[PDB]
Each structure stands twice: as structure tokens, then as C-alpha cells.
Design a protein around this nucleic acid. Sequence first.
RNA 1: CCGAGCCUGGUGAUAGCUGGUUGUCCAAGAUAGAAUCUUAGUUCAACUUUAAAUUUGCCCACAGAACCAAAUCCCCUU
Lengths: 73, 59, 93, 148, 275, 140, 159
Amino acid sequence: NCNVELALTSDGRTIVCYHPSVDIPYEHTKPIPREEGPMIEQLSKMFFTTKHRWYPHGRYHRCRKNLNPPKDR
Amino acid sequence: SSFSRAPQQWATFARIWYLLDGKMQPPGKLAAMASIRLQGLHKPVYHALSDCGDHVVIM
Amino acid sequence: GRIPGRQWIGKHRRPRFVSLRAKQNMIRRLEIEAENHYWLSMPYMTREQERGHAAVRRREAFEAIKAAATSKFPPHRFIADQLDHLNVTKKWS
Amino acid sequence: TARGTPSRFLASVLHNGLGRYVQQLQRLSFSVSRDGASSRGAREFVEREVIDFARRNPGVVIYVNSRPCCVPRVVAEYLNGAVREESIHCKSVEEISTLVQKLADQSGLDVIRIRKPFHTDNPSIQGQWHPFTNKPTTFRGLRPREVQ
Amino acid sequence: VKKGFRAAFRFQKELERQRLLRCPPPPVRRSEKPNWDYHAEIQAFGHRLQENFSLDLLKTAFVNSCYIKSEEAKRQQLKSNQELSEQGTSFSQTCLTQFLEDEYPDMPTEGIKNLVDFLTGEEVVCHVARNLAVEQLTLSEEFPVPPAVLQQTFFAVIGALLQSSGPERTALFIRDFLITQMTGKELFEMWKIINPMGLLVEELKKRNVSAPESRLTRQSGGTTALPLYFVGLYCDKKLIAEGPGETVLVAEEEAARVALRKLYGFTENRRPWNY
Amino acid sequence: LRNRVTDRYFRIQEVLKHARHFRGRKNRCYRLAVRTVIRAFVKCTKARYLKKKNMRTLWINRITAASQEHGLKYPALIGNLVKCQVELNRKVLADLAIYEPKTFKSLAALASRRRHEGFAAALGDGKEPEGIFSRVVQYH
Amino acid sequence: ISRKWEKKNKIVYPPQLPGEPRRPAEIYHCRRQIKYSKDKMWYLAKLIRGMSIDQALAQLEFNDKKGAKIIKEVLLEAQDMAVRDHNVEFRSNLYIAESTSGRGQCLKRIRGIMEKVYCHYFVKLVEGPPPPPEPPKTAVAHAKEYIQQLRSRTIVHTL
RNA sequence: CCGAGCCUGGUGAUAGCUGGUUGUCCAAGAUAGAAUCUUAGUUCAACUUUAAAUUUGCCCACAGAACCAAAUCCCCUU
């Protein structure tokens, strides 16, 4: 997919790109219709990940955790 | 643009489902295309620590 | 599937083969070499004309070398340095 | 190293360059020693070059004292509150003038590692990429293998 | 017992510094912290912001009313702040409304009132006050200085500037120190609304355009716990917005927020302020 | 013991303050720490060349993703942009792929147009007019 | 040799004002030089680190350990002086907040160098019902925490 | 613990042999050879380092170096 209008100036010195937002038409839209082992396995199958994500980590890793991290943007 | 910060973050990083038809194809070309799409290298967002994968259904 | 002693030294070595990269690299270097031969192919002077055209410059450079080697001597010693060392115990009035 | 150190993102203070450049320093607190060869240099700086510095920037008030708490020093206090304490034990007047100009030029933010050398807060103007920028729409919005 | 003093004294000062971090000192005012001189530091405040205040007006802007009461209470064993604070508040509200009208003409008066309230709110004027160091030069009841008193003091400073050197320079002050506080933020975290689809519906009734339809433009993962939905808001075969959400209701209401931003012109792309 | 050492505590703490976030008697005991704080400062001083290399392959991965999403490959995109004389680097092109995709869409389209224009001149090599974006700017 | 536990008992707070929730009374006690090792007494101390004082006294009457007898003695001592001195109005309204044990000044003899051991026992009691055991986290908690992390992730190493 | 006790002294025995030799920083710096009861060492040399006097130094074509191949000396010049 690529749909733009490219051009040069007369001098051949700068390029001009022209490229507006194509919108989604009305027709292209649908309308709105209106135990620990089992525990970790059903989490894994609910979130499409594996069980080592859900097994805990000790006090030592949780203490190396940062709790007040910097925030940007 | 002009979405709120958390809805924009969600839509940027969400998980997308790809159907790939295996009739007559070679398993290695199938594997190449699905391997890229599973690591999330088909996203300009990609990084290894961002868990930016996507789902692939090979039928 | 092994290589007997060390991989690259000795009687039986692991085979190594030439690829498209190695051939193409060798060939671009050989084409630079051919152009080197061509541009050394055409001298301007020969020995009889070049003999003596840089006597002034070579002897000038050697007088510079000789003078900078012979002018090697300890620096001067002043008074203001020694008295600036007395300026360490300076106090405001 | 960089992991044995707190880090921060690149910051303004109060969007300091937008409307006007607000000199991010309030105070210098000098302390020089009267009878001291350790503070001979800071003495020479207060003698020679602090008048023109105070004249050069009127935003900062410069107090000097004699006989500090322990050692001759400068304590700059910046606008965002952070108080920097640099030590001019046994420095020349030249080094003291460069250290002071650095303080008066710097903003009060830390010298810890800065994560990114650029801080746009409105990065995208044509909208940040998401998986549905350029996947083309369909007729009645059907997904693949739709019966209808 | 090893002979010597430098190392024993180095250790003693190190223990003192560890103590100063373990039990940090109780926060007490910079005005009685050493190396202080009020008149010079008033003049430093003026030359730092680079316009001339009349010094008596600036001082009486800093001195509060509660401080006067407590100072009489201390004295039993001055012109206050309040007139300057009223003038500063009146002028700051009026020219903030003026600046935001001239830059955002389509925004409704309720929205622009919420913008002015955000810019003159407690938290923003507390931060601009503290990071401008009026929090040191003010005289109040206790340290730390309470945020209401900080807001009142800062607007009093603006009032002293207004009486001192004119509405143009005072408007430059308000602009360069309060509108920079909205550069970077969004409309709907500056004007907190509820039922944004409702706000869209009534505002389109004002515009005499039909009430919009919601459509489900794009989606993924419709039957798991990580869906994506773009719900678009359309009106008469064309759209005014499209927005994301983790479910259809959130996506629709966030697309309503996107529509309201685009209708008021307060998007992310808008022509940045002309400083 | 006419003069022996009294400041050894502070030298020890110069190593241990960088060791404090280690794991084990590396963070406590000084021999173990010295050996492993040296290795950490060396790891830093090589990780700077590493960080430059790693960034630039991240940029190649991101530009590759976006240009394959527009129908190019990364070799085609960089090669034909340098032929059309836009001297953008990978860092800016990667940020343009993520943050500014309409501009990247135009860049991919221009790279395709330059590829096919330059190769039209290649197919008709010999006396032909110079290509439209194959016009170059040469400095006297 | 350092006795800050007993001095911790004698730390005295300033008076309260009527608009404050009621401060729970804190009682520290220590038994020095038990002829028993620090880590057997650690097993008993970890056994009673959270129990209401009457249940703790039950477990410690019917354990089988020399430490169990010595700990029951210490806890009865601390309860007695808590309702006698530190103004704990209800005798049973105490719970064991810290129960620890540390090592003492051990003595030596030749067997090989045999070290006849000695340990300490420390206990702090607090007014009030014991704290509930925080529930072991469930599927709603895990799903919410995963989704919070996935909403927290950003586009790393660019603007 | 006797192919010749144990102790104290001479005794800080002698070790061409192993091991060990503690602050920061910067800079120059690599493997002809000879003789030796000598090849687990050393003395000279060659190389290396600092400081000094100077004045030529390294490379290269041509001419040139013996009768019974690759190359190397050599030096006006550059």
C-alpha cells in the first residue's frame, strides 16, 4: 500500500510530498452488536503465554524491583 | 492521532491475528512468514523487550 | 564429524572454500591494481632530469634538523618564580 | 556504572526556554578562609573576579563569609530547590572562575544519567503507528473466512 | 590504637552525613536558614524575571494576612496581601480567557472556563510558585507554605506587576508562566468531563447535524481478554472520528472524546502557541 | 608499628559502594567485590561500542518492518533514497517509521519511483534523457 | 554485647490528641544466654511469629523442644509485665509481632574444637487482634496485574 | 617419625630451586650470537631506556662484486 502524490519544484532542488488522510467509508464498517496448578494453567490459556510468567518471585527480586520509576511523555 | 494516552498505547501495542493457508506451500516459507509475524518484526514498533508479538494461525 | 589436531594448523586442516564474496573482493582489488600499474606507467622526468632539482630543499630540511638538534639546552631560571613560591603564606590584612 | 546509578529523563525545569529564559540559580554561598593557604585561591577570586560576576548576572545573590563550618566552599542554591555544594579547597583563581561560571550556567537538575537526549512531548503529528494504519478495509468489514 | 586525626575525623563527618539522611532534618524556612538577606533577594527576584516591580508593592504582595495576625500574636508578649491578590486574580482570569478565546475560538465557554480553572488551579500554581521561588520569599504561618496561600501569593505578585508596569507586560507574564503549563497536556485531562457521547450529542444538536451513528470500523481478538476495537463515529455516510478501546463501549466513548477534540479544534496537531 | 594505615576503611568503601547491588559475598566481602567491580567497569567501557552497534541494528529492524509493510525491502529503500539524494539516516528514518507514518509512506513511494525511473534509464541505456528524479545536484 | 532491645522497651512517646486513632501498645522482651542453639530456636521463633498469644502458648506447651519450654516462660513473663506495666488492659489482647532469635557468647572446649552454644530470644508483643493472613493472590489479581503491565509498556529506544 | 637421637647454639645456615613482592597516572619497549663441570644459570654482545654531542642517517636505479634460481651488498640522487 502506497497512495501519494509526489512532485519536484521547477528548479529540481526540493521534493514535495502530498499525502492526506484517507478515511474509512460508511460502507466498510460493521455495526455494533449489543488449586494453584489449574489456576496458572487457566491464566496461561487465557493470556496465550506460559506458566513461568505467573509463578512468583521471591522477596529478593521483588526488592530489587524499582517502585518509583521515571516517567516520560 | 488525538487519542488519549492509554487508548493510544493500547492500540499501538495490541495483538493481531493472521491466517496463513498451508496448501501446497513449503513448510519453510510458511515458517519464515510466521516466524517474523510471531516475533513482531512486522511492526515498526519492534523491540525484544516490548513483548510485541502477534498471533498466527496456519491452517 | 571432527578435525584432528587443531582446525587450521597442521597436516590435515578443516577445508575452507572460496565464495562469491572472496572472489569479488579479490577482483575489485585486482582492478585497483591494474589502474595502479597504468598510472605508474608514465614517468615525467627521468633520472638525468631529476638529478639535483631538490638540493636546496633537502639541505634546508637538514639544516632545520641539525639546528633543532643542536639547540638543546636547559631553560632559564628567573626570580619571580621563587618569590611566587613565597606567595603561598599570603593572608588578608 | 549506569546500573549502579539512578537515571532520569531529559527535563526542562519550568519549560524554561519557552517564553523567557529564567536564570535557574538563586544563591551562591561562598566561604573563604582568612588565614589559610588552602583557601588562598578562593581568596584571590573574591579579591579579583567576584565583582564583575555579580555585575554580570543580577539574578543571583552572592553571600561570602569567613571561617566556614569546616572547609572553604561554594553552595549554590538553584531555582528548583536543589542545593549543590562544590568544594574549592586548594584551587587556583582560574579554576574557581570556571567552576563558578559552570554553576551559574547549569540548571539545578541532577548529573545522573539521562536516558534520552531528546524530549518531544508531542512526538507524532500524523499519528503514531498502530497495526491498523495501512491494513486495507473491506466490504461490510468482513474478516477472512467469513461466511457472510 | 592507631595514631592520627585525619581519618578519625573523616569517619566522624561520614557518620554525621549518614545521620542526616537516616533522620532528615525537619523542614524549616529558608528565611531563617543562614545566608539570607531579604532586600537583596527581592531585587534578585525582580531581575531574575527581568521586569521591574515597584519594591514596596512587591513586598506588600508577599506579606499575607494570617502572617500579620500571627505577628501581632507574637508581638503581644502593615498592609496585607488581599487587595493585590484580588486584582491579580481578576486580571489573570480575564486575560487567560482572552488568550484562550483568541487561540481557540470554537471552544465553548464552559470548556474555556475549565481551561482557566485548570491554569489557575491549586496544583499548577503551587508548582509554578515553588519552582519560581515565591515559596521562599513569602511570609506565612508554617513551613511548608500551604498551597492556597501560595496561589494567593502568586496572584498577588501578578497584581503588583499589573499595578507596576502595565497590562501588556502583565499579560506576557501570565502567558509565559501559565500557558506553558498547558503545553504538553490534553483537553480532557485539563477539562474533566463525563458522558462524552452525551456532550457530543448536544453539541451536534447545536450544530443542527443529525445525531451520529457508531460503527465498528476495525477489530481484533473479539473473543479473548485482549481485544482491540476501533469504533468510528459517523454522521450521514461520513465520519467525524475513530477511536480505540479494549471493548466496544470504551472505544465508542473514546472516539466521542476524539470527535469532541476535533470539533473544538483542540487536537494534537494544533498550531502550537506563538510565544 | 611506627606508621601504619588508618584510612583503609575509606579505600574499602570506594570499592564496596559500587559493589552494593551485586549478589552474594560479592556485595559484602572485599576480595570478591574488587574482582567483580573491575569486571563491571570493563563491561561498561566495552558496552559503549556495543550500544552503538545495537542501536543501528534496531534501526535496521524497524525500517525493514515499515518498508516491507509498504512493499519495499530495506536494501531497495536505502539504496534508492541515496540515489535520489535524500541524506536521511537510520535513526530519523526509524523514528519516521514509528512516529510519522505518512511521511514514511511517501518516502517508500519515492524510493519505488526512483527505482523504476533509474531502471527505465538502465533499460534504455545509451542516448536517453536523464531521469526525472535521476537529475542530480553537483557542486562546483 | 548490646542491649538495645530492652532499651527499645523504654522508649516513651509524646502524648496523643483526641482526634487520632489509638496507638497499639508495644512490649519488648529478651532472654539472654539460653543453652540452646540459635537456629533450633529459629525454628520455634518462626513457628510463633504471627500467632495470637494464647494460641502461641498452646503450640508451645505441646511442642517437644527445650526451646519451647524456654519460650513459653518468656511469653508468660512478657504478658505479666505487659498487663502490669505497659498498660495493656486485656491480658489476651496481645499478639507476637516479632519473635526472633540470635546467637550469644559461645564457649569452647577440646573434643577438634567443640563450641558449646548459647542463643538469645527476642519477642515483641502488640495490643490488638493478630493481623489477618493476606490472601494468596487469585486469578482476578493476576489478570489485572498482567494487563496493567501490558498497558504500561512503551516504545523503547526511540522518542 | 633412627641408612645414625634430641635439644640449644654457629644460624636471619646455603639455596642457579618453587612460592611471594602492597598507591594513582602516562610514556618508550620483544625472542642475532659467544664462552662456560655450561644449556633450570651467568659474563660479553645484539636489542631496550633515559640524558648529552652532533652530522649525516635509512631506502633505491645505473656503473660495479669468479673461475670452478628467488634474491643480497653498494651508493650519486630522490
